[PDB]
Symmetry: C5
Subunit: 103 residues, 5 copies
């Protein structure tokens, strides 16, 4: 086991960390057909999506997506302080793979 976000992130091909150290600026949640996604923003314009679940997503992968969106929300809403993000740079916007929180 990886022990940290950095180490975790290292284990995937099209990956990358962002070091935010700030709370999310906006949260968007879509229910719209094929657009069942959440998008987040930082005051610097850093925009990130939580992916539309696909069949490219394992079983394990899928639920734990619903959880990432539960997390984005409570963080957004409690005024967070996001540290870093692990992300799939091979998408626009960048796909959140993992989040790290620390005050």
């Amino acid at each position: 086991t990886p022990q940290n976000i950095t180490d975790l992130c290292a284990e995937y091909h099209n990956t990358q960390i962002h070091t935010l150290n700030d709370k999310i600026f906006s949260y968007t949640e879509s229910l719209a057909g094929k657009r069942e996604m959440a998008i987040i923003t930082f005051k610097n314009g850093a925009t990130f999506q939580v992916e539309v679940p696909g069949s490219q997503h394992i079983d394990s992968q899928k639920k734990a997506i619903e959880r990432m969106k539960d997390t984005l929300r409570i963080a957004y809403l409690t005024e967070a302080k996001v540290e870093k993000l692990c992300v799939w740079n091979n998408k626009t916007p960048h796909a959140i793979a993992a989040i790290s929180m620390a005050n």
Copy 2:
């Protein structure tokens, strides 16, 4: 992959943007047969519904109506602040497609 709500909205036919910049005045919720839904209001009188799930409801779409419901509830209690709303104008009350939260 849309990077904001406005754009997202644009990917559809009976759609429309509301820019409120206000928290929900009221929140309504129901379990009575065939009217299993939620309804939000604002102090200008603008009312919006989260629909009762039916056919034209992808299973993934379906799970997503549920999360909307959690969302308008917590947003309601946390003294909200809803920037935008993508809605199906071909409904009455207007059908919530997506929500945008900005501070």
Copy 3:
């Protein structure tokens, strides 16, 4: 589609509106067999129940009952003023069909 809590209650047969404009005095919960339920109490003395699901509920309704059980708990913990309650008046305690919370 109902536009508010009042015309929605009207859609139903053995219903009626109480308008409280007050917070929940007490909340109660049982996991006891055949009594898996919740009970609300208002300071004036008014008592209501979130009914135990049995045949008389449509599957969809069941999912709704759990969300209802969720809203009452949180409104309670928060001291969320409860505006109205649409209530099936053919049960004792009065069985809740819908809840309205206003600012």
Copy 4:
């Protein structure tokens, strides 16, 4: 149907009420195989468990245990104030039947 914890407690035969009028002092939760449960405590030492969901249970019951677990964490974190508790006394510790939180 019953409209208070007292009437409901009494519908069962290996029961008793505890009147605490105080917030939960400690909250313990476990994923230990076969010991999937929680234990609550009060300041002076009273201990109660929410059971591992099995086969003396009725099923309607199985989800209602889940929510009891939810109610006790939230009540813990938000420093609640337990009015009452209905408990199966033929079990050590005391297995929570129902819970009462009063304003």
Copy 5:
């Protein structure tokens, strides 16, 4: 049945206790394939993992796994303040089995 964290941990031999009497320093959640889990950190630099739901789990536990991720998140964001930890010792990072929270 166990009466406390100490008791429970006491039933396994590949399990060890940690007493922290501190609130979590960092919370890390991942949805990356084969890495769907969470990581928590203490300022003493103590690091813990909630395991990915593998073959060494019972279906009861899987549900509980979910719950533990819910607890850690609530505790983190709430400045929780964890007392003790009963952990699975034959792994690194040490994997959680049960938590105790007192205040």
